[PDB]
Homo-oligomer: 370 residues x 4
């Protein structure tokens, strides 16, 4: 069975964003935290890898790092003025990169590394070195616009990997499925006019970017039909998210026929996340990984790459990423998620569950899938 | 205008619950936090008072502490075996108090103090020393059963205050309205068979206690009709919570005619809370405080007491408690909640908002109010 | 007995210095802290006041805040270009203020406030409103040069207070005694050429500024003889520090005859401090406060002002500041310093103690006091 | 050149000691920390390994874990009643293990693992698999008595490794050199009556155990002459510690002729440590490692094992352990310790340096080495 790669580097846990009280910059009426405030902490991601190690999983994966993405890699997506300006703050120690977007010293080099991990994960899977692969890419990428940092993201990790594979390995169609709980606004924008990449985003209605739902934004020119947004109702849990995958996402894969499936894998839809209002647990992420691995098996030789995005519950995200790596690798450790049964009990009752399914039905109909 | 009391003591910020990774005890597969993990931190509550101070509000309130609740106060609600056992862990340093319930050294004396603050707040308002009053009671109370600690609560702060007022000041009918996002399971239980206290709970369907909704639990014997549960759908925000107050809660007050309204005032329905999935902001809590103050004005001489319960978003709860104290005191500081506009944009769209209103309509009909 | 003022403001705990791993800025080879790294935390100072409150001491003191120091106050010490530049970083959020000196948003206004507390403490004591007084001035002042921030200090808190008293209340001679464990380099510099202020500094040989001892730096022109440095050997404890006070400091007061004694009161000579290597405990600071209060009683009507400087042991400094406030107020709470006996056992044996005394003897002889 | 082993396991960073304000248990007058208080944090040790990784050093070492020490391994040093009692608290979650000694859930299994790492490090070097070796053994061992936990230590890591090597690999004489800044009281006690292990301890006079210096404690019966204590004066720095090694320690090795040298390698003599008052920097530890490696080269085939003990400066210990691993491996990374020059300037002047040398001279004479 499965040779699964896990692309990670200690340096990615060193990127800092300065002083934050959870999401809020310090000053004015925001008192400095006595804690280690700032949701996008290394700890969310490190805890995952630590739990992989202690669970026994890590030795059974193909561990790898990567060379950082080259200047030329970056330029397939981002214009120089943007790259130069992000490099210039990095080389200061700090400043700010336009409205709500702060880094720290050496964030440039670390963001290039984060994007490189994604690049290498894509390549190893495409070449048949690995059956599938995960990339613990920090900082994340899915909100980054070509010319504007957004949502803790500074480079477009997945698009950079994809355009590199398109240029150096003749990658054809590719589907990017984004189950981070925020909209994949950066991916969507980059591929809006293109029919060669299907971009699909499951997200919390109105969460981030705020007030954006997106269901009627289908793509432009040749790209029309090749973008799919699924604005799930805040509050939704396991039944809704899996219904959405099975009723919309997988059929959408079946129709488009990718050579490769990429997950934008955020865990911030988990039931304890401060940055959204969804009720997923470890088994939810386990199942979704199953659904996309199996589609990948039917459609593109099992070729699945997952790239870490968001996730801000420091105690709970590790149980979710473990489950993901377990489904992805085919290997089951002894860890039992200590909150699984508690979150199962918290799930919306049938009235909501049916309302949400109805809504997902109307979207599948709207997108020509039902 | 308003002489508003604010009952607080430094000692309440000293109660500790040991080593937690947010909600999870440390050990097994739960790695020790490098942060200061444990949601029920002093910081959530201290930050509120700190922001009151820097905003200029604090000097314009009547600040008070209190003698702790007496043994005899405690015994109106709790049996000795329970009190003795909680005292015995407190006097050890720690142990545990049955399934998921941990304290620290001296938590007994501090819980007695927390309950005393609530007692004194009730009395000062009843005697006409104060128009209204808030009690920064930590640890909280609303989940505590007579004989079982639950949900970070060790004593039944509000019932202890109420039965003390019933015995020493001839308090008659009283309504307790609980807008902490978890069920007021402890209040409900204590007053289940009684017609002299109306207990009303707005809470997230199935959140805590897990899997409990409660709409058909109306009370027993004489107490039938005198308990009201409102299980709001996870995901709901400002429109829903205020609709619920106006369509169910206030009419329910109007019908029952209390001599006193007490809020169980949790802030964990705020949009960034890790311990629930609701989307309230500072203006939401401001409005709800307005609605209950005005009912209090019409029905019981303006006599409103608020007692702090839950709230786990360290950066955002202070803006919410400020707003509450501002509505309660009648005084508006210069602070503008820096997330207000962002959370407003995140609010559920009209499809959900109408579904939730419909559900609230059917409950008002079920409870004989519409 | 004693009307003791305690000048403090919540705003002083809001000044931030950004992301630090204890003393080290983040980046390069310095990994971001998962803790709340940065020695100059609010917590060191807040913990002191919290322990005063819970000990029962606080209600028995005259609590006060202050108007911030005026622009004109600041200009008696600092040139405009320096003030304008510090104001400009404050109004950015951050930058940096030359070699190793970082602030946060609104640090300007908070530093003005910190200095105002010292100003008001000096005035209240001088006017006979208060017998004596403490100022919890954060950020500290004693390392600040007129035109350069240094050692976490941005304004010269004590000199600003003194020159304001000199200009508005005809203050004559004043002695400033600095038992912060670092050199009072800022005070020394401001008063180097002046005979009207005696500046005395007890400090760790070579600690901060690094490699500075200072014994032969006595003052310039009229100021010659009116500066006294006492470079204590790293490692020294209670016996040494009290010997130094009694053999050098108090006699030096006796000779100069001040109208006022001011302590630069740092606690970083405590035995657990990461920022020096001295072995003082709570009773050490208690005794030193006694020695200077009694000199003040003999020489200037009991007029003693203490102004908080350094101190970086978060768990231990509060016990030390409590002891100080207890000696200063004349009031003994029930708190017993839980480390007192342990640190007493750690004290240097007689060989060192005698070597240190010898060294202090040779300095008293050198300064014409023995 | 050198095949250097580095024995570490993620599980050792999971051992917890509950709620501490640096060294102080929470309760009474000790306020709960808002930080992550408790000096013996995982972070001190993790930061070292993280910096090894980012510096490029780690891939050039032989990384290994180990099976935990067996029950039988443990019993060569510890009696069952002690083992059973420590196991019983571990299996509770917590309690306490006599006067000032707290663990957490699963500390037993993790302490066995920590001791196993030391066992395996000793064996690999003895068998000629590795030239030398380091063991990141957490929790530490050097203060543990057979029947009493002490100083954050629960098992006697180094003695357990040594007696296992004595029983399974015919290990003869061995020298244990302890440059943790606290006395090696546990090692000393275990080997007090024995001539086959030389135990040498450099430590801060009176620090821990408190009030113990130890110079005249030489050993009992056959063990007389085979224990050496060097009580350095609090305050001492690089010149003193290296003088002590060269004038006492190395000659003492030369005389005894071990088959193996073991360092008890604590970093708490570093200049920023809250738990002692010494002024060492990264180059200090680098040099000491050089001196003992070279003795090892002359005397026992280069066979040197180092086992991690104490070290509580979270930002500075990593630079020190890096330097150690660099000297031990023979490999120099690009990292420059950003505090090296600052701490060099802080070093005691010549008067102290000469006083300390004199004291070390008199000890070498007393021990028959000069
Ligand atoms: K998404
Ligand atoms: K597209
Ligand atoms: K409720
Ligand atoms: K009732
Ligand atoms: K000083
Ligand atoms: K002078
Ligand atoms: K030692
Ligand atoms: K021996
Ligand atoms: Zn996200
Ligand atoms: Zn479920
Ligand atoms: Zn709650
Ligand atoms: Zn709204
Ligand atoms: Zn200082
Ligand atoms: Zn002493
Ligand atoms: Zn040590
Ligand atoms: Zn040096």
């Amino acid at each position: 069975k499965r040779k699964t790669g896990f692309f990670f580097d200690e340096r990615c846990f060193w990127h800092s964003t300065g002083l934050h009280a959870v999401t809020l910059p310090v000053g004015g009426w925001v008192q400095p935290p006595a804690g280690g405030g700032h949701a996008e902490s290394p700890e969310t991601k490190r805890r995952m890898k630590n739990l992989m190690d202690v669970s026994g999983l890590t030795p059974q994966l193909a561990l790898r790092s990567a060379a950082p993405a080259s200047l030329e890699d970056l330029r397939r997506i981002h214009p120089d003025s943007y790259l130069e300006r992000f490099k210039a703050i990095s080389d200061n120690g700090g400043g700010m990169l336009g409205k709500e977007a702060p880094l720290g010293p050496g964030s440039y080099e670390i963001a290039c590394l984060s994007a490189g991990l994604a690049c290498a994960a894509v390549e190893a899977v495409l070449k048949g070195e690995l059956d599938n692969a995960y990339s613990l890419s920090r900082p994340p990428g899915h909100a980054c616009l070509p010319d504007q940092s957004m949502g803790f993201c500074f480079l477009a990790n997945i698009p950079i990997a994809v355009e590199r594979a398109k240029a150096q390995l003749g990658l054809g169609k590719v589907a990017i499925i984004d189950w981070d709980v925020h909209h994949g606004n950066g991916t969507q924008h980059i591929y809006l006019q293109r029919d060669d990449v299907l971009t699909i985003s499951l997200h919390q209605d109105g969460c981030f970017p705020p007030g954006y739902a997106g269901e009627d934004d289908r793509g432009v020119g040749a790209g029309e039909g090749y973008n799919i947004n699924i604005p799930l109702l805040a509050g939704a849990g396991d039944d809704s998210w899996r219904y959405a995958l099975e009723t919309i996402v997988i059929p959408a894969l079946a129709r488009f026929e990718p050579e490769l499936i990429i997950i934008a894998c955020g865990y911030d839809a988990n039931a304890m996340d401060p940055l959204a209002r969804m009720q997923l647990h470890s088994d939810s992420f386990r199942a979704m990984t199953e659904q996309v691995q199996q589609a990948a098996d039917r459609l593109c030789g099992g070729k699945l790459v997952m790239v870490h995005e968001g996730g801000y519950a420091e105690s709970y995200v590790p149980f979710c990423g473990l489950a993901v790596m377990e489904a992805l690798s085919g290997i089951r450790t002894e860890v039992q998620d200590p909150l699984l049964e508690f979150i199962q009990q918290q799930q919306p009752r049938a009235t909501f569950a049916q309302f949400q399914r109805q809504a997902i039905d109307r979207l599948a109909q709207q997108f020509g899938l039902q």
